[PDB]
Amino acid sequence: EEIIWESLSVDVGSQGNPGIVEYKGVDTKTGEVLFEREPIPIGTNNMGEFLAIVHGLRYLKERNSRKPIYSDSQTAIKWVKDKKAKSTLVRNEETALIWKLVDEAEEWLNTHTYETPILKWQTDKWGEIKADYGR
RNA sequence: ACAU
DNA sequence: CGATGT
Ligand SMILES: [K+]
Ligand SMILES: [Mn+2]
Ligand SMILES: [Mn+2]
Ligand SMILES: [Mn+2]
Ligand SMILES: [Mn+2]
Structure with a gap:
């Protein structure tokens, strides 16, 4: 209904899907970039959306902030709620890094x-x- | 059909 | 046009 301007917004970016994946978090009110993940060679849009939310949770908890997180990804919101990222991405040597980050999240x-x-x-x-x- |  | 997901 109404935008909660006192919030953290997160999003994935990619070159290909599957492809090179990164993510960032910004202050919703000002657009200031608060964190950015170094690009990961192979992952999916939804894996990156998931990692962005979890990183936001960790960022806010570390600084004792009660602000909400916005995401545009219905999939990633559900995966966080379930504490389980149900990605279809094959697990192989090429995808080991992203899968390590997802498992760690x-x-x-x-x-x-x-x-x-x-x-x-x-x-x-x-x-x-x-x-x-x-x- | 909706969300990326 | 293709891919990721519920
Ligand atoms: K969008
Ligand atoms: Mn998005
Ligand atoms: Mn986007
Ligand atoms: Mn886009
Ligand atoms: Mn896992």
Whole structure:
């Protein structure tokens, strides 16, 4: 209904899907970039969206912030809620790195607590999420 | 059909 | 046009 401007917005960017994956988090109110992941050689859009939310959870918890997180990915929001990323990406030598990051994110979710609301950014009403890569 |  | 997901 209404944008919660006091929030963190996260998004994936990619070159190919599957392909090179990165993500970033920004202050929804100002667009200031708060964190950026170094590009990962092979992953999927949804894996990256998942890692971006989990990194946001860790970022906010470390600084004792109760702000919500916006994501535009229905899939990734559900995976975080389930603490399980149900990706179809083959597990092989080429995909080992992204799968290590995903498994490690799930492990974090299963060993830590948080109250952070994870909210759907309503692209159809509000335009692109402020962490979008412009591609 | 919806979300990327 | 193709791919990732519920
Ligand atoms: K979008
Ligand atoms: Mn997105
Ligand atoms: Mn796993
Ligand atoms: Mn985007
Ligand atoms: Mn895009």
